[PDB]
Amino acid sequence: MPLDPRVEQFLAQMLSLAEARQQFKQGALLLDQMVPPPPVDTEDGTVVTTHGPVRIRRYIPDRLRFSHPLVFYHGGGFVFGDIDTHHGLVARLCQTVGATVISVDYSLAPEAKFPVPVAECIDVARWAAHEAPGWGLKPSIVVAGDAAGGNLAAVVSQRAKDESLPIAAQLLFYPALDMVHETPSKRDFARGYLLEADAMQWFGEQYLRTPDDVSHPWASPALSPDLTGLPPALVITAEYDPLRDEGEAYAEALRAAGVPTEQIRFDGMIHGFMTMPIFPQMEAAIEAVARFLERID
């Protein structure tokens, strides 16, 4: 419950759009150098979405143990990140679960704005549902994402029924869910825990079209008043993350809507930890993912 010691060390030791994207990529590949991912067979590809081609990467496990494709949406505040920044997480998800994983390079803001990545993420999920029989898998997919990518996975899940899209589960890793309400964790951990109040504002300015967008349910899936019938859900939070309370409240709300829900707070942890392989909690959370999906298919 105190701040993990390795996290403390991490936090102690630490301007242009293109080069802000760059330092994000460099921070990521620096973590991967320090703690290399397992080897995994991949193949690049493209998906035709209603907003353009979107690059994807398919991960193939050494040993296929799971009978649904995972579709992973990377985080980074809708502004940063890509297939490469999240390779360390996706590689381990692929090998630990023994699932084929579709990692998605959706359109980043501010070039694309809300709700372009929502539509594209829906299109890729539909693509994967269509391909699944030909991979030898069940047609129902698992959607998954971290932070901003958890937001997308949550919106995709809520829109699944309307869009005739089969989803077997949703893995939300410290997701952003509510852009309207100021929770206690948002106030208590506003500064100093990697993800900051000022950054969250800036991401919002880049992603949304106008301030009114914050209350739209495809920006804020938490405001959706009827969560009955949604995909079984694994919701992971970090204790010391401003996003913690919305994530946890959402899992509570799903539980009360009859949705089979597993809720896990990682104590001592901060936002982003599932892409930070310097922390052993990253692999623990990946084992949590593998255990949860055993209870699915």
Ligand SMILES: CCCC[C@@H](CC)COC(=O)c1ccccc1C(=O)OC[C@@H](CC)CCCC
């Ligand atoms: C090896 C991979 C490198 C990246 C890794 C750190 C080394 C993880 O970083 C993060 O998770 C992260 C860090 C800073 C800013 C944003 C994020 C992020 O994903 O979500 C931002 C949230 C803001 C609330 C979107 C909500 C918009 C209202």
